[PDB]
Enzyme design. Structure first.
Site, PDB file in Angstrom:
ATOM      1  N   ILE A  85       0.850  -1.172   0.000  1.00  0.00           N
ATOM      2  CA  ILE A  85       0.000   0.000   0.000  1.00  0.00           C
ATOM      3  C   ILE A  85       0.886   1.222   0.000  1.00  0.00           C
ATOM      4  O   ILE A  85       1.753   1.354   0.878  1.00  0.00           O
ATOM      5  CB  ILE A  85      -0.926   0.026   1.237  1.00  0.00           C
ATOM      6  CG1 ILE A  85      -1.703  -1.304   1.326  1.00  0.00           C
ATOM      7  CG2 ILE A  85      -1.814   1.241   1.158  1.00  0.00           C
ATOM      8  CD1 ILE A  85      -2.473  -1.460   2.704  1.00  0.00           C
ATOM      9  N   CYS A  86       0.614   2.148  -0.935  1.00  0.00           N
ATOM     10  CA  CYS A  86       1.244   3.474  -0.964  1.00  0.00           C
ATOM     11  C   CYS A  86       0.303   4.469  -0.293  1.00  0.00           C
ATOM     12  O   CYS A  86      -0.681   4.931  -0.901  1.00  0.00           O
ATOM     13  CB  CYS A  86       1.562   3.870  -2.413  1.00  0.00           C
ATOM     14  SG  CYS A  86       2.474   5.402  -2.445  1.00  0.00           S
TER      15      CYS A  86
END
Ligand SMILES: Cc1cc(=O)n2[nH]c(C(F)(F)F)nc2c1
Length: 152
Positions: A85-86
């Site tokens: 996840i960014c």
């Protein structure tokens, strides 16, 4: 001892006042090996999917962020094919936004919000990001089909 006391309080709050759509729990008997689930939001292409996540609490918590990845595949500009996840609150400053006054519940809520509102400005998935920006009907159809295939 500091981390232990903090985790006991977080687990209590996650068990008794979980945010809507979010569940988080101990995999077994270690307070720092957790799992979570986020329900697909209505008015999103992930609606009526259930998304499982792994929540690993590092040794220096709360001064390092939880390490959170999707276990359920999801089609999204900011989430890669391994579930990374960014998201700013999963990262340390100066670039990131993690701080010890955040907690597991707030960052799971931020991931839930990211699902509703992607950030094409900070993509992990360039082809999905461009599709989201320039061909939103195709993005929504592909995101629904991926939800049907992997999350339902
Ligand atoms: C769900 C939830 C609500 C809430 O208020 N808190 N507060 C803390 C803290 F402060 F212990 F880290 N965890 C939570 C979790």
């Amino acid at each position: 001892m500091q981390r232990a006391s903090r985790l006991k309080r977080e687990l209590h709050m996650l068990a008794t006042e979980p945010p809507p759509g979010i569940t988080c729990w101990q995999d077994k008997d270690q307070m720092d090996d957790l799992r979570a689930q986020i329900l697909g939001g209505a008015n999103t292409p992930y609606e009526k999917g259930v998304f499982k996540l792994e929540v690993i609490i590092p040794e220096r918590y709360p001064f390092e962020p939880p390490q959170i990845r999707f276990l359920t595949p999801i089609y999204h500009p900011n989430i890669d094919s391994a579930g990374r996840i960014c998201l700013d609150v999963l990262k340390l400053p100066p670039k990131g936004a993690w701080r010890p006054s955040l907690n597991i519940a707030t960052v799971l809520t931020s991931i839930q919000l990211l699902m509703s509102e992607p950030n094409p400005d900070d993509p992990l998935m360039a082809d999905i990001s461009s599709e989201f920006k320039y061909n939103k009907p195709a993005f929504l159809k592909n995101a629904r089909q991926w939800t049907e295939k992997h999350a339902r």
